[PDB]
Design a protein around this motif. Structure first.
Motif, short mmCIF file in Angstrom:
data_model
loop_
_atom_site.label_atom_id
_atom_site.label_comp_id
_atom_site.label_asym_id
_atom_site.label_seq_id
_atom_site.Cartn_x
_atom_site.Cartn_y
_atom_site.Cartn_z
N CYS A 4 6.21 -0.96 -7.47
CA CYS A 4 4.80 -1.33 -7.51
C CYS A 4 3.98 -0.38 -6.65
O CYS A 4 4.42 0.14 -5.63
CB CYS A 4 4.61 -2.77 -7.05
N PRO A 5 2.73 -0.15 -7.06
CA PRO A 5 1.90 0.86 -6.40
C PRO A 5 1.32 0.45 -5.06
O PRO A 5 0.89 1.32 -4.29
CB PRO A 5 0.80 1.16 -7.43
N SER A 6 1.25 -0.86 -4.83
CA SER A 6 0.69 -1.41 -3.60
C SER A 6 1.28 -2.79 -3.39
O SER A 6 1.89 -3.38 -4.30
CB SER A 6 -0.82 -1.50 -3.65
N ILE A 7 1.05 -3.29 -2.19
CA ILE A 7 1.47 -4.70 -1.81
C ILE A 7 0.89 -5.72 -2.74
O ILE A 7 1.59 -6.61 -3.24
CB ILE A 7 1.01 -5.08 -0.37
N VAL A 8 -0.43 -5.63 -2.94
CA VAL A 8 -1.18 -6.53 -3.81
C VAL A 8 -0.51 -6.62 -5.21
O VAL A 8 -0.33 -7.68 -5.83
CB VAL A 8 -2.70 -6.23 -4.00
N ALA A 9 -0.23 -5.43 -5.72
CA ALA A 9 0.36 -5.34 -7.07
C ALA A 9 1.70 -6.05 -7.13
O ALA A 9 1.97 -6.79 -8.09
CB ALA A 9 0.44 -3.89 -7.51
N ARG A 10 2.54 -5.83 -6.12
CA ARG A 10 3.81 -6.56 -6.03
C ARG A 10 3.64 -8.06 -5.94
O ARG A 10 4.33 -8.83 -6.62
CB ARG A 10 4.65 -6.06 -4.85
N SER A 11 2.71 -8.50 -5.08
CA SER A 11 2.48 -9.93 -4.94
C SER A 11 2.05 -10.54 -6.28
O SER A 11 2.51 -11.63 -6.67
CB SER A 11 1.48 -10.21 -3.85
N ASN A 12 1.15 -9.84 -6.96
CA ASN A 12 0.68 -10.23 -8.30
C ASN A 12 1.81 -10.30 -9.32
O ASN A 12 1.88 -11.21 -10.16
CB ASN A 12 -0.59 -9.64 -8.73
N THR A 30 -0.17 -5.65 -13.85
CA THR A 30 -0.37 -5.34 -12.45
C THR A 30 -0.46 -3.88 -12.05
O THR A 30 -0.89 -3.56 -10.93
CB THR A 30 0.84 -5.82 -11.59
N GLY A 31 0.03 -3.01 -12.92
CA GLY A 31 0.20 -1.61 -12.55
C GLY A 31 1.57 -1.25 -11.98
O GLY A 31 1.80 -0.08 -11.67
N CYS A 32 2.43 -2.26 -11.81
CA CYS A 32 3.83 -1.99 -11.48
C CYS A 32 4.49 -1.32 -12.70
O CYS A 32 3.95 -1.32 -13.81
CB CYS A 32 4.57 -3.25 -11.08
N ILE A 33 5.67 -0.75 -12.44
CA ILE A 33 6.41 -0.01 -13.46
C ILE A 33 7.86 -0.49 -13.43
O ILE A 33 8.37 -1.03 -12.44
CB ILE A 33 6.35 1.51 -13.25
N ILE A 34 8.53 -0.26 -14.57
CA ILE A 34 9.97 -0.51 -14.73
C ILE A 34 10.63 0.83 -14.93
O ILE A 34 10.20 1.62 -15.80
CB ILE A 34 10.25 -1.40 -15.93
N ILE A 35 11.66 1.09 -14.13
CA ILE A 35 12.42 2.33 -14.29
C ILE A 35 13.88 1.98 -14.49
O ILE A 35 14.36 0.94 -14.03
CB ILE A 35 12.27 3.30 -13.10
N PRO A 36 14.66 2.87 -15.12
CA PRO A 36 16.09 2.60 -15.35
C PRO A 36 16.93 2.80 -14.11
O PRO A 36 18.03 2.24 -14.04
CB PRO A 36 16.47 3.52 -16.51
N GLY A 37 16.46 3.66 -13.22
CA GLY A 37 17.14 3.95 -11.96
C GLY A 37 16.84 2.88 -10.90
O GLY A 37 16.24 1.85 -11.21
N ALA A 38 17.25 3.17 -9.68
CA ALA A 38 17.06 2.26 -8.54
C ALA A 38 16.18 2.82 -7.44
O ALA A 38 15.95 2.12 -6.45
CB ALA A 38 18.43 1.89 -7.97
#
Length: 46
Positions: A4-12, A30-38
């Motif tokens: 996630c790009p920011s705290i807010v985004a993660r909380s959302n 939210t603007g968060c992303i999903i990636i295949p890696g870790a």
């Protein structure tokens, strides 16, 4: 893996997930992303 790009985004994101919403929808919501890696990149540090 979700990143996630920011705290807010993660909380959302975490609220979005409570009813069971797919990660992909919570990502665009939210603007968060999903990636295949870790390893989240520096601009998606939260």
């Amino acid at each position: 893996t979700t990143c996630c790009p920011s705290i807010v985004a993660r909380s959302n994101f975490n609220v979005c997930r409570l009813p069971g919403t797919s990660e992909a929808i919570c990502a665009t919501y939210t603007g968060c992303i999903i990636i295949p890696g870790a390893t989240c990149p520096g601009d998606y540090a939260n």
